[PDB]
Structure formats: structure tokens, C-alpha cells
Symmetry: C5
Subunit: 95 residues, 5 copies
């Protein structure tokens, strides 16, 4: 098992490609605020053309979420925030 | 292990059948809001005869829940919301 | 591993008996509201003559709790609510 | 694996000794209120002469915490509350 | 597994170097308040050239976070608080 993480900025999708026979586990998403805002930051993941909401963050009420997410194939993280980045952390492991 | 997720819309149940000798793990349920609302979105699962509440979401107070649920047999997810979908995410694994 | 859950009603204790060499894992407790109420719903477990509080729920502030509880021997669940049931969910696994 | 739990009262530190080659996993701490109060109940553990905060409870805002704590050796639980007990629950398991 | 915990003070980074083929699992971060404050305490970790936000604590709203973090190599913890320490707790295990 190895540390993994990525910072996802406004208006940009991050593609993540697990290595063959490996997984990416996402444990947490946290706001990295840029400008003070009450905006709702909707987190999404796209896997094989399906886009699912994985939570809503906000600076004042929901600054982070703890998760038990597992990805065996390529996925794309994105969010609706414009006044924050979202930092995803977890780990890689064999599958 | 493999990524798993489903979107559950108002009024309709989603029936999920774990593959033979496999499990579905549900890790999170998150609101995908359609219209701004303070409604309570009661989440239920039906397994065998039995329907159980697995949490209450709301756009403003409880927009997601993190879970450690495991299903070995057919189950049905539904919710009482009318102004949001609920997106369930987790993973499949053996056993 | 197998799905497990129980509904615990006002004023009544629910007894749960793990089979020999099995465990019951409780993952979640959620309010199943009957009448709208601000009451505090204190959750208890009794195991071998010890009674312990395992959380306090409320419809408005704490409608559910996520847990990592393990029971290898008979136990009883009860709560102090009168305007809701509490639905406990998790799984059985080998011990 | 086996159920484990202990009640920790005001002004009483509780020593817990895992069995040899075993661990205690603490999964939850919950307030067992005695007198209605907004006090902050700071939970601490001491292991090997180091005392660390494991969380803060309160009757109104934080009545419980869910944990993934593991202790392989003797430890001591304590808290700062005077108007509640704290109930700690989890399990024992082998640790080889 | 073995108990692991560290106290991280204002203005000081804490470097951790796991043993080879071992990991540090961090399970929680909690404020150890020094003076009453509503400050936001932003938690960060550095792993090589990466620096990621791992949550935001506050004495009044977010005094602790529970998470599932894994570090296999050197890392450094820090936070932006000035009116509290942050206590990070988890366990060491083989990798
Ligand atoms: Na399994």
C-alpha cells in the first residue's frame, strides 16, 4: 500500500488511472479554500461514462467528508466549486 | 474488488442482485438535488421480507451519509425524496 | 458475510443472539420517525449484565450514527425514544 | 473477536490492559449524561507516558464520536467531564 | 498493529519516517485547545513534492475528524492553528 492524493481545481477534471491489477482507495475529500464562500461544492466521479455525486462540501458546514471508495478502473474527479480546490487523499493497493 | 454505484430516483425502487459468491458494499449515499428543498429524504433498504431505514438525508443539514453496509443477496433501495435523487456508491468484492 | 438488521421499538428491548463462531457487526443506527419530535433518543446495549450507552439520536440534529460495533455473544438493544423506532443495520460474519 | 466496553466516570482514570498478543479496538465514545450541561468533555488516552486528546464530546453538539483506535499495550482513559460518564465500546482481537 | 500518536504544535512541522515495509495509519485528528478560539485550523500533509489539505478543524464546530489515512514513506504534518495543538492518532502496521 502507498499514499495517494490529488488536488482538483475549479473547472478541471482530474483523470486517475489505477495501475493494472491495482486499486485506488479514496478516503477523504477536503476543501482547500481560495476565497471565503458559502457555495455548495458538489463532488462528482465519472466511471465508464456514468457520473455520480459523491458528496457536497461547503466551507462553513461540510468542510470535509470521510469515504470508503474503491476504484479498479479509470475514473474522473470533478466538482462544482469556484472558490475552492478539493483535495482527495487515500492510497493505492493491489487488487 | 470493483467500483459500484447506482442513482435512485423518486418513487422508484432499485433492485440490486450481488453476483454469486460476491458482495455489494455500500459506502456512501449522497443527495443529487433537483430542486432546492428542506425535505427529509428517508432512505430504505428491503432485504427478504424486511424494510429498514438506513438514514435520513436533507439538502441543507444532511447531504450525505457514510456507511459500512454489506449485502450478500438481492436488495432494494428506495427513498422518500421528491426533489432529489440519491446516489449510492461502494464496491463489489468476493465472499 | 450476510446482511443483518433489526427494528427496536419504544419501551421494548430487542434480543440478538449471534450463532456460535459468528459475530454481529452493527454499522448503523437510524431513526424511523413516527411522530415529529425533538426528543433525545438514547441508545443502549446490554451485554452480560453490563448496560452501555452507544449514542444519542434526535430527528433534527442526529438522525443516524455510523458505527463499528462487534458482538460475539447475546446482547439486547433498547432506546429511550417514544416517537420513533430505531433501525439497526449491519452484517453477520464468521468469528 | 469479542465485545469490549467500559464506563469512565468523572475524576477516575481507567487502566485497560489488552491480553498478551492481543489488541483493544475502541470504536465509539458516547456521553452518558448525569446532569444537563453544555460542558466540553475532553477525552484523553495515555500510552507509554504520552497523553493525547482523542476527542471532545458535549451533550448538545457532540454527544458521541466514532473511532478507529487500536491499543496493543496498556493504556489509560480519562476525561474532563463532571456532569456525564463516557461509555467506550469496541472489541478485542488477536494481534500476532 | 501498534498504537501511534503525535502532537503537532503551532508553527512547527512534524516529520515522520516510517520503518521500511511498514505503514503509519492515521485514524483521527483532534484539537487540544490552548485558549478558546473560533479559528479554522487547516491540517496539511507533505509527502515528497505533494502538499495536501487533510481537513479543517475548529474548537466550536469541528473539534475532531475521523479518517482512514495511510503513509508508507516519509511525511510531514502541520497545521495553521495558533490557539490549539492537533493530536493525530492511529497505528503502525506491516506493509
Ligand atoms: Na469478505
Amino acid at each position: 500500500m502507498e499514499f495517494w492524493g490529488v488536488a482538483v481545481t475549479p473547472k478541471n477534471a482530474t483523470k486517475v488511472t489505477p495501475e493494472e491489477d491495482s486499486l485506488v482507495h479514496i478516503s477523504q475529500a477536503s476543501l482547500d479554500c481560495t476565497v471565503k464562500s458559502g457555495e455548495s461544492v458538489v463532488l462528482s466521479v465519472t466511471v465508464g461514462g456514468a457520473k455520480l455525486v459523491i458528496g457536497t462540501l461547503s466551507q462553513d458546514k461540510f468542510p470535509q467528508i470521510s469515504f470508503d471508495l474503491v476504484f479498479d478502473k479509470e475514473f474522473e474527479l470533478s466538482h462544482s466549486g469556484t472558490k475552492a480546490n478539493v483535495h482527495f487523499i487515500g492510497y493505492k493497493s493491489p487488487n
